[PDB]
Amino acid sequence: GPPPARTPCQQELDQVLERISTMRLPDERGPLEHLYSLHIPNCDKHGLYNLKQCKMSLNGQRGECWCVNPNTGKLIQGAPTIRGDPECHLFYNEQQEARGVHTQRMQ
Template identity: 40%
Template sequence: MSLLSNLTTIVLVLIVHCGSWTGANRLGPFKVCPSCRDPSGAGRPPRDHNAAGSTSVLAQGEPCGVYTLSCAKGLRCVPPPREHSPLQALLQGRGVCAKHSRTNPTERPHPTGRICFASGDAPCRKLLNSVLRGLELTIFLSDRDIYIPNCDTRGYYRKKQCRSSKGMQRGHCWCVDEVGTSIPSRAREDGTLPCDGE
């Protein structure tokens, strides 16, 4: 009776072991990369650049990011639509190679009824140019923080402005309108500062 029980145990262990081994073979010999996920959440094998037909650029629809291969000519790596943090998405490799268009999907439309400046004359761009001229050829050995304005592509202020961080200490942030006027805001419990339309 003891022999039959031992044989049953061995057979069950072999079935479980072989079943998991054949399942692993179907997936292929690769490690899953948490930052390399497709929309369904499944991992992808890394590209074999030595394989026949392999290229050194990514095709349309392929996942991309800051630390991946470049997209093919005429394509650019764009974050997912309505992504709350487009830069974070590209840093984590969650972008997609798509056809290059002249319009910037993350750019805010021109406000109606407001004064429009040429890009070099826009308020944020003016301050940015002034700060950068002052910092040219400077070596930073001081512990004072630096304010470099956060401008959009048109030269206006982005809604959230921050002073530079010091080591692991985040710099002070505040909310502004397009021309840089401070807007009252309150930090969340987790310390993040929500500036509407960010």
């Protein structure tokens, strides 16, 4: 069957694992190059969240990482790509370099 989870870190991870495993395709939709956001939230053996996560896109084109302060590890600094050094210290830049874009449905 499904493997048993208990600690919901493992359960979240398995929802990503299942959907990743389902979507095996080199490219089988259309013009795609800039739409990747690959993250798997691995847990401690006692079911803490990992102290640092990373995000993948293309095989070695970048590799942002960050740390977690909270257990939810989802209080990301508002930069879903960091320049590449996981300097956790804060999340307030002042300069409105970007205001971000993420809200875009698919129809």
